Design an enzyme around this catalytic site. Sequence first.
Site, short mmCIF file in Angstrom:
data_model
loop_
_atom_site.label_atom_id
_atom_site.label_comp_id
_atom_site.label_asym_id
_atom_site.label_seq_id
_atom_site.Cartn_x
_atom_site.Cartn_y
_atom_site.Cartn_z
N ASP A 124 0.82 -1.20 0.00
CA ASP A 124 0.00 0.00 0.00
C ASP A 124 0.86 1.26 0.00
OD1 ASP A 124 -2.27 1.86 0.86
OD2 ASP A 124 -3.30 -0.07 0.86
N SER B 255 -11.15 -1.17 -0.22
CA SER B 255 -9.87 -1.12 0.47
C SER B 255 -10.00 -1.39 1.96
CB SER B 255 -9.24 0.26 0.31
OG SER B 255 -8.68 0.43 -0.97
#
Length: 279
Positions: free
Chosen positions: A39, A224
Amino acid sequence: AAQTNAPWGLARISSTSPGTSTYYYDESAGQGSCVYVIDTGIEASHPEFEGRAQMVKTYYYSSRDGNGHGTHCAGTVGSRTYGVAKKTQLFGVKVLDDNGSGQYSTIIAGMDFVASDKNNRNCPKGVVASLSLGGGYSSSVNSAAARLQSSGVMVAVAAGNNNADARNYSPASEPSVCTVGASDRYDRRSSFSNYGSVLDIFGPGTDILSTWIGGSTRSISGTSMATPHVAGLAAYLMTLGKTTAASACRYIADTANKGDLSNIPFGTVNLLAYNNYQA
């Protein structure tokens, strides 16, 4: 164990019903497992991580999370208050810049990095990777996710936020990984969640409270946010010995709450991640 006044998504993953606020889980809490958060990075100094988070790789000038997204996702995996697997080890791989963007070549390199780097870490209960990212279909991106999974890592990926069929997005469309859609606190498909036959499971994704940069917290929404619930759940179940990296997606689907979500399109699984913990 019971955590009172927990974020709704934690309570949801340990419940057969919506509308409760206590999270119930076995005290082993993912100890001995490891979760890679691929990420924007992780603010490992956040008190919520208790020394259990560390950056292991970046492709940019810093390994710091200058965005917040990766820190939020990591918090849902494993922070003390906001996390599913409160004793897991968290490893950050920064493939996204501080604007949240990244080239597919960098993302692929990050996935192959994790497949090798796990051999440099102590994860006797197993290894998970959480990928709250994606873009348009790419066979090379899907192949990288498939390699990571094949190497012995439970790969959980976001379905995407386009209210569209996830077959057209990567790594969401890779069959061999665990593709995660998002639901809300009333058991409705999140308004933005992708759908389709490639989805394996839904997790909480609307209005999810977790860690943020600057030692803070905030509530945000997305597939997410659903993905790290599933990644943390996998780590938790692997520590319990109930499943393995290669079988955890199927196990989570096997043990999910079934048929409880609304606005699931015909042909998409109606399965909500559930820890089946009996206190």
